[PDB]
Design a protein around this ligand. Sequence first.
Ligand SMILES: *Cc1c(COP(=O)(O)O)cnc(C)c1O
Ligand SMILES: *Cc1c(COP(=O)(O)O)cnc(C)c1O
Lengths: 315, 315
Amino acid sequence: SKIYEDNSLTIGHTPLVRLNRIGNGRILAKVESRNPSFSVKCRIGANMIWDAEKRGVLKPGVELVEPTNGNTGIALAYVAAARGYKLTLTMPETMSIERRKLLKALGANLVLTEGAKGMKGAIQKAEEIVASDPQKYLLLQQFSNPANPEIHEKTTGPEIWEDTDGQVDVFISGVGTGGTLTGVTRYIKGTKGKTDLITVAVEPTDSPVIAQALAGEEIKPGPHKIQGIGAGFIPGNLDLKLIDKVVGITNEEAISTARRLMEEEGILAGISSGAAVAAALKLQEDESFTNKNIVVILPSSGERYLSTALFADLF
Amino acid sequence: SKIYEDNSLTIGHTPLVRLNRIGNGRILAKVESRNPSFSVKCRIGANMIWDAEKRGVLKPGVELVEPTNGNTGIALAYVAAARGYKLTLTMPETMSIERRKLLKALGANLVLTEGAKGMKGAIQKAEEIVASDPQKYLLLQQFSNPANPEIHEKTTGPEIWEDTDGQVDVFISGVGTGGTLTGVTRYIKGTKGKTDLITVAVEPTDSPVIAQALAGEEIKPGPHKIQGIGAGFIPGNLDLKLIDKVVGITNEEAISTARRLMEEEGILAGISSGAAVAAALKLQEDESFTNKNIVVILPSSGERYLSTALFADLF
Ligand SMILES: *Cc1c(COP(=O)(O)O)cnc(C)c1O
Ligand SMILES: *Cc1c(COP(=O)(O)O)cnc(C)c1O
């Protein structure tokens, strides 16, 4: 039989679909919205909590706290509800009412911080709360907790190797916390020894922090609209030495390519999914990439961004 | 290798999750939102189109038309985009702008009909269009097309039998087109010969059309808020003789139970998912159901209904 004890155990095994109209027919898309709370974060939500239980730092009585309202907040919320923990999320008071209803329905406690203070303010409040009683509260820290890239090394990477029978030549991943790129690459180049794999990091042209860092230049971030990637600094969970190439993508390229995924392939896709695919299209303009099999990660579904520019001016 | 030719081929194999706080620990929930366009309809969207191709009535040049804007419209739209067909959907002009943006992004052509005329008006327009050129247009008809219950007999039913090792005693399904209930029951009672399986149909107390029909009373439908079920008539795809029991559920019971699924189990759920589970709770008040394994279908995710009463008054 195959009966899951709780929803956090259903993560992974997402499909690899060939794109037929976008590109030359060799781009293979991994659909991470096929997860329990519908995004690639479902995997780390589950693993960061399972990891804390195994280390003995998470048990009944200990509450969770994290400064985030994006896909990671949604993922932590369904896992905490599924396994019986209380969760507090801090975020700017400017946050969509849509997002807040969803998080609240999953039972999360929402602590809204000063709009003018942005993310730094949310992060601030989260630390005050945990300092208030360090035995009662546990902060997970998605950008540096090793349990994040660990789940990708244990599930995402193996799924990709298996589904392509090891025929993957290029791996493309837009970077947010960096866990996906780091974990999958460690498994393929490290564990399976395919050192000739080309790992491509994708980021906003408007906040090319990874390209800067790799060239030894100063880190100068900027605002952009590709939700989910380009945090503006180099995350502890991003292993810079595993990267072979970085590709910068514009807001317009990301949005228009996300739209082609929905209209031409029938795959609901968010803005960052368009950015990763637009990167594959650029590489295919170079003849050395002509006959290579390219695997790209599609992080989330367009349905979660119905209020953004992704859907603006359709009629 | 396991590389899908297009997204319509990724349907099914949804997880069976045990509910731990709702009920006595024997309710097993099948999560149908783990599908390519996130609902149980993804399966019939794919099969009704594959079936038309096999019968030779659907080929390049023939366009599809269907009067619907719900999960079936979203399902037909991703399959048509994935396999290269043009699709026209007719619906009342009163339809949410949210729903229209989503359908449009998937490339569907939207024909809006008179608000005052409701669904009947949409159905009307669809027939005019097809009559305008019957060689160019193809109407699928979800309520009576046998390809709808056929996919459930071929995938959903076998998945349930396999995942429980044949230990399922009660099967609960809210009825919309009736295909899920009919197909799964045909497989279990028919093909596997488990004739003492108890099949339970669920419907709105405010439009108990199935209970009426079974008692030989007049069919008197009424309005209700449990989106996705209770169409107000007996669908050609519902086989009344396969039903052992009918349970009526109120709008309030459906909504509050859908909320418990999210908060207590971490499973994003729509209103009709709450209705099906509330039915299991009622049967468990009867001692003859105390030690039986109950499988319930959860049709869609709560994220698709963020604008409804499901999320009203959370703060
Ligand atoms: C998390 C996320 C990413 C980035 O993935 P990481 O493994 O954090 O680098 C991309 N897009 C979206 C929508 C995300 O939520
Ligand atoms: C289609 C649907 C149902 C009913 O399932 P059928 O197999 O058509 O009887 C229930 N809930 C939702 C949300 C649906 O879309």
